[PDB]
Design a binder for this molecule. Structure first.
Ligand SMILES: O=C(O)c1cc(-c2ccc(Cl)cc2)cc(NS(=O)(=O)c2ccc(-c3ccccc3)cc2)c1C(=O)O
Ligand SMILES: O=C(O)c1cc(-c2ccc(Cl)cc2)cc(NS(=O)(=O)c2ccc(-c3ccccc3)cc2)c1C(=O)O
Ligand SMILES: [Cl-]
Lengths: 237, 233
């Protein structure tokens, strides 16, 4: 096909091990998540993949995944572009809570609604939230407008602020012939995949992208996939 | 009072820093990596914050930057890579140790190259083991036939570093952006020479330390207001 696009979802983070909602909280990779990134990079290296430009979020679990991949494929020299628009979904007031704390505070019914809903956000992260200054006052978001800095996000909100970056910054690079690598997060990558495949809300909500595994798209000149997404890695994985 | 920080990478693999590593893309040794860790160490102890980072396209400088960004929890900063901050290109000498260099070219000529601002070493030719490795490397494929060196005098190195400083770095400093530069001995020499208005003799005697943050305080004209300071103990 005319173009080739590679996606990679970061692996396990330190807060995944505590089953805590991270969202915009800047949790690092766990040792196992770092090893996942190494295996994905090895897979790209074995398959001879070459890139011209890389995009990632401003969160270290995705950035470190990208670094590890670039090291594995000996392409540390590539230009890298970081954007808040590829950040993980913002989980609002759930940020920092674990599974038990979330169920205890909100109840089965409410949490079920948040799980399955496309456009119902979780509660807002208010100024007295333990992570409010950690996230909302981080200087990396200093340049965001008031309406851009979320206090919480539904999946629809996340996709809505990721796709502008796709359309305005990534698509031109692809049509320029650049081989793009995107290292990001489950829900921002969901945004890109929904756009690429024209998926419904129900379908995207059921899509669970594997972690640490290069996801390969073969795209025609209008960026329409010519075949299903392919996963890279030894036969078992 | 603008604040500018430079860091020179440390030791590279296989003793290549004592072997004219030049444009060969040598990685850091474990010890050079530890040096970068100590430098980032010191920058975080001092509470330094940056807004934009510049580095070469050589992995020993890039990995030094990565290690620093990791130590100071600023992995999210924008990073700009450019061949114009690469190490001096040592031409045919690249990869030779001092004894092999003297054996092949003679003590007299080597002393001349050592001392001269504007005399390059011999070019890297196809029989050199790094020739295709460097000159056909994809990362330089957009360079024009005049931009891609086969060899460089120190004059050449500084001449192709300063256009990047002037066109890309200076505007950032003038907007108040706090700049970090992770690069190499001779490309950093170019910057230090332009900053301090040093002579050719003086710049050839300047040996910047490795792995140690180098702090400049600049006025509204980007002239230093005091000598460079090192960060640590
Ligand atoms: O022992 C049972 O009777 C039982 C109980 C529950 C249950 C009990 C109390 C609460 Cl507060 C929430 C759920 C869940 C069960 N399994 S579940 O339906 O698939 C299911 C699993 C998980 C969640 C959930 C909700 C919010 C945060 C995280 C997880 C929701 C539903 C079973 C069961 O049948 O084993
Ligand atoms: O992987 C996932 O898709 C997942 C997502 C969420 C989540 C996501 C976003 C928000 Cl805003 C809030 C929550 C939470 C999760 N764990 S759970 O809270 O305990 C939990 C367990 C079971 C149910 C449920 C619902 C309806 C019918 C039967 C069972 C609901 C919740 C999980 C998960 O891993 O199962
Ligand atoms: Cl980077």
């Amino acid at each position: 096909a005319a173009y080739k696009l590679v996606l990679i979802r970061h692996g396990e983070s330190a807060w995944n091990l505590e089953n805590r909602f991270s969202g915009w909280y800047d949790a690092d990779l766990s040792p196992a998540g770092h090893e996942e990134a190494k295996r994905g990079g090895q897979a790209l290296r074995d398959a001879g993949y070459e890139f011209d430009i890389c995009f990632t979020s401003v969160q270290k679990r995705a950035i470190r995944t990208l670094w590890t991949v670039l090291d594995a494929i000996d392409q540390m020299w590539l230009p890298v572009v970081r954007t808040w628009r590829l950040n993980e979904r913002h989980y609002g007031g759930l940020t920092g809570l674990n599974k038990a704390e979330t169920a205890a505070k909100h109840g089965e019914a409410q949490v079920k609604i948040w799980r399955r809903s496309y456009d119902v956000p979780p509660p807002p992260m208010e100024p007295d939230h333990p992570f409010y200054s950690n996230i909302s006052k981080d200087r990396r978001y200093a340049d965001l407008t008031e309406d851009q800095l979320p206090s919480c996000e539904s999946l629809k909100d996340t996709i809505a602020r990721a796709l502008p970056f796709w359309n305005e910054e990534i698509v031109p690079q692809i049509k320029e012939g650049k081989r793009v690598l995107i290292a990001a997060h489950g829900n921002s990558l969901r945004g890109i995949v929904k756009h690429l495949e024209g998926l419904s809300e129900e379908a995207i909500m059921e899509l669970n992208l594997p972690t640490g595994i290069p996801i390969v798209y073969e795209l025609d000149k209008n960026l329409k996939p010519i075949k299903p997404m392919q996963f890279l890695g030894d036969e078992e994985t």
